[PDB]
Amino acid sequence: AFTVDQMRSLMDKVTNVRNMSVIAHVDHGKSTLTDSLVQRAGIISAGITIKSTAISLYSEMSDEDVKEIKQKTDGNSFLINLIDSPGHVDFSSEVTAALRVTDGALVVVDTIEGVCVQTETVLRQALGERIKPVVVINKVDRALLELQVSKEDLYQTFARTVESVNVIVSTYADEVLGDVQVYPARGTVAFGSGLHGWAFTIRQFATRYAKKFGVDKAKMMDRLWGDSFFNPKTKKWTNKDTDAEGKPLERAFNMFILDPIFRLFTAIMNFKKDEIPVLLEKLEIVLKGDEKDLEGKALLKVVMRKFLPAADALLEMIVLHLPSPVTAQAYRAEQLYEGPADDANCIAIKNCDPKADLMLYVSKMVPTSDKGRFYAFGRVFAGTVKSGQKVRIQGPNYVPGKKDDLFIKAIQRVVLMMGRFVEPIDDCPAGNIIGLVGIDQFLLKTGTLTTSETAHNMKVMKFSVSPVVQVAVEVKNANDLPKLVEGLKRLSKSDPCVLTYMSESGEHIVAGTGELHLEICLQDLEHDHAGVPLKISPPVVAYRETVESESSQTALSKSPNKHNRIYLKAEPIDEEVSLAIENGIINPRDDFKARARIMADDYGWDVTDARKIWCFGPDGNGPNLVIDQTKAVQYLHEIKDSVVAAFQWATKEGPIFGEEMRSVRVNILDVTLHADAIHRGGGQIIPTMRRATYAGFLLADPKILVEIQCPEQAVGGIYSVLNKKRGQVVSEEQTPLFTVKAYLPVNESFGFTGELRQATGGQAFPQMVFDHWSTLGSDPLDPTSKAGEIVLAARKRHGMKEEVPGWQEYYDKL
Ligand SMILES: CO[C@H]1[C@@H](O)[C@H](O)[C@H](OC[C@@]23C[C@@H]4[C@H](C)CC[C@H]4[C@@]4(C=O)C[C@@H]2CC(C(C)C)[C@@]34C(=O)O)O[C@@H]1C
Ligand SMILES: Nc1nc2c(ncn2[C@@H]2O[C@H](COP(=O)(O)OP(=O)(O)O)[C@@H](O)[C@H]2O)c(=O)[nH]1
Numbered sequence: 001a002f003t004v005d006q007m008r009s010l011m012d013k014v015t016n017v018r019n020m021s022v023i024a025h026v027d028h029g030k031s032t033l034t035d036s037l038v039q040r041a042g043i044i045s046a047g048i049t050i051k052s053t054a055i056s057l058y059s060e061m062s063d064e065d066v067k068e069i070k071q072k073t074d075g076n077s078f079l080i081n082l083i084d085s086p087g088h089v090d091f092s093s094e095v096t097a098a099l100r101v102t103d104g105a106l107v108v109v110d111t112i113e114g115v116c117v118q119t120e121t122v123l124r125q126a127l128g129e130r131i132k133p134v135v136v137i138n139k140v141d142r143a144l145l146e147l148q149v150s151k152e153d154l155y156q157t158f159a160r161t162v163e164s165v166n167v168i169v170s171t172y173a174d175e176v177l178g179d180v181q182v183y184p185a186r187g188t189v190a191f192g193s194g195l196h197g198w199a200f201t202i203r204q205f206a207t208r209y210a211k212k213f214g215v216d217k218a219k220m221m222d223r224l225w226g227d228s229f230f231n232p233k234t235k236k237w238t239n240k241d242t243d244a245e246g247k248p249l250e251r252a253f254n255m256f257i258l259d260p261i262f263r264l265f266t267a268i269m270n271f272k273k274d275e276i277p278v279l280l281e282k283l284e285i286v287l288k289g290d291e292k293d294l295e296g297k298a299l300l301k302v303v304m305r306k307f308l309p310a311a312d313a314l315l316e317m318i319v320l321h322l323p324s325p326v327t328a329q330a331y332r333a334e335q336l337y338e339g340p341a342d343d344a345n346c347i348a349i350k351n352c353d354p355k356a357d358l359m360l361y362v363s364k365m366v367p368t369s370d371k372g373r374f375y376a377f378g379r380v381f382a383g384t385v386k387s388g389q390k391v392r393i394q395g396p397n398y399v400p401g402k403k404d405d406l407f408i409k410a411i412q413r414v415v416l417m418m419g420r421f422v423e424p425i426d427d428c429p430a431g432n433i434i435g436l437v438g439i440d441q442f443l444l445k446t447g448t449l450t451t452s453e454t455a456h457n458m459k460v461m462k463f464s465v466s467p468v469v470q471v472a473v474e475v476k477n478a479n480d481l482p483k484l485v486e487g488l489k490r491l492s493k494s495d496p497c498v499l500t501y502m503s504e505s506g507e508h509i510v511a512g513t514g515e516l517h518l519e520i521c522l523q524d525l526e527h528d529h530a531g532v533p534l535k536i537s538p539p540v541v542a543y544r545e546t547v548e549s550e551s552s553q554t555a556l557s558k559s560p561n562k563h564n565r566i567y568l569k570a571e572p573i574d575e576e577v578s579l580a581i582e583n584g585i586i587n588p589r590d591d592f593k594a595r596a597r598i599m600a601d602d603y604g605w606d607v608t609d610a611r612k613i614w615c616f617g618p619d620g621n622g623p624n625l626v627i628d629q630t631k632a633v634q635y636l637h638e639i640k641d642s643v644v645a646a647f648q649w650a651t652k653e654g655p656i657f658g659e660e661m662r663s664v665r666v667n668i669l670d671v672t673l674h675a676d677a678i679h680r681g682g683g684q685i686i687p688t689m690r691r692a693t694y695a696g697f698l699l700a701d702p703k704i705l706v707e708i709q710c711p712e713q714a715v716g717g718i719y720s721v722l723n724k725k726r727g728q729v730v731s732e733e734q735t736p737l738f739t740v741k742a743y744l745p746v747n748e749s750f751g752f753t754g755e756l757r758q759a760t761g762g763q764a765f766p767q768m769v770f771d772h773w774s775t776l777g778s779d780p781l782d783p784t785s786k787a788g789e790i791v792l793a794a795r796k797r798h799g800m801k802e803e804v805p806g807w808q809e810y811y812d813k814l
Contacts, residue, residue: 125461
């Protein structure tokens, strides 16, 4: 329990600060270990609550210990910030953000399960942030109590776990950091049981046996680990595991450190009441009062706490091995800073200079109980931030030259982020973590605060990574729409791999990396983010409605009045031309003359037809056209707007099942109008044109990028699956892996990710994006053909009649 003054004093000696977190796979004991740390060294102040985000620990080392610290030290007191990290381990950006504010990590590994993918994933991300690791092989009690494992087996298990870990480290750690691997002999590996208050270092035992073996501890701790044997028969220390006769010698670690512990466990747990007093006496352990009566685990717990007070082992590795900002910002400056390496701000970062201009990185926005207000959490890399200070808020898109994302505003208050609470403070110099109030509106997620107009902005760690699984989300109660729209924003910000957007059909879409990911997202969206009943339903694939040939016969339709008639034919527009329209070569607003010269000279069009295009559709710019081929219609000019409008309507909603048209050309052959405009009005001609277009369309023989990375030998599975799903290979490129690109119908992609791992031995990684467009040759009007099935499914899904109205339905015989 410290006062604000004591805390602030502790925060001045950043050489004696440790910013770190605990990395662990679910159930490996991350929680019980931190409870242990908190109960042993947690710090507390001598009605606003927050979600626990970080905890402060306090530790004192002996004068000799502090001498062993291979880094700048000021005194024997240490302040340890145990920073909370998310539990989602999908290489998410929320995790990367949390690690970014730490410098070291306590990696928890299970005695039995060893290093699992989740563990490798966070560690890999950590190494990517140049974080130094230290390991704790947890749940050791399981191997002794449940599995009855033997000493050499337990040893071997420990050694294999340590090797698995140093494989990940040696693979992803920056060579510039040197050897960041972990070594039990160097004290960077702890062993124990977070559930059961005892731990040790070889050093403590060396101290204990040095003045007893008549040898200095430097010599003793080297002998208490690895291949050092003490032959009781010769009374000598050797490095050979056998004697002259070749008989097996027990390792010094086993003989002097493990055996005493093993004997204590065995004697106490088996109630050997005549063997316990002696053993305790020999180890100089003293039971006082009610303790003398304890037995079994109760006695054990109490005896081990006295003999070797877990937290102690962990704190020792944290203080002695994890890195302290002055030291680190010297080699981290350039990465952290986008600007010039010779820049005034970069230098201020390298020197962790508190008198320079401000360089404060906003790690994330944290939820507060202050009615919808989020406080900015971050770290001062340069300068010092002050309450009421005028600063420059630069979002993710800011550039020193443009005024994008820029926001000048005063910082309302600078607060210490202590667990769920805050503590207003006047200022905070470079090298410290801190919270800012009043930045809510201008920044959401990461950012960069500066006090220099020149200041440039600041920068992120081996499952699917593409949002291939998507559903439509909608409120059950219309009035809730606002909360949903807001919830999606909140959801997107908290999840890097989550995607939300509005569909062509007006539905909010939420897409996730995999079925499970999407499920968490929807649960969180509904329960928290939006907090309102949501309705989930089918991603729907969009299709286009086109024609394969010219109308088999002139289309004829009359107006409601029955006085007006339009005669037309529909024909295919060449792909190259549709593409040209879609991509900017042939444009709706270009000068009709020059455009017609291009369409005629370069695309084979008849220049008169081209000069006479009346409009593009849908939306006035789509790849469908109306060309005027009439000769002597008197009031043509007066119906043009109605005809154009009807086309925008027809091409927007095709007659097959309501999808947009594409590559459809319509030629107006003739129009017969009533002499009086009353009759001829849009309300008469718009329906006529739309009815005729649908008819010409139906009479024209109507018709309606998956990137995979993987090893060579696995590629064969890819072709195997694709062939089972109307797939089609596109490209096979490459000394990393391979990358196969192919087209995969959307209605053949449900469960694809599963069948692919199954066919590639879990070695292939898919990625999918909507691509097109390809014309299906089957009949859209035949409920049993490939195209027809798709059309029948969409029609039922929309509550339309199953049978597709045929052309005769829009044809008005003369
Ligand atoms: C960056 O992420 C990308 C990729 O996931 C992919 O390109 C995806 O495709 C979405 C679709 C896009 C197509 C174009 C807009 C026209 C046709 C559209 C589609 C309709 O069937 C095909 C894909 C899949 C879709 C339906 C089923 C949702 C599309 C849609 O948005 O409706 O879009 C997101 C934003
Ligand atoms: N046997 C054993 N179980 C442990 C140990 N530490 C934690 N556990 C158990 O493992 C489960 C998960 O522990 P927890 O601390 O919540 O792990 P986390 O979710 O990874 O942080 C709980 O049932 C614990 O009681 C340990 O050292 N030994």
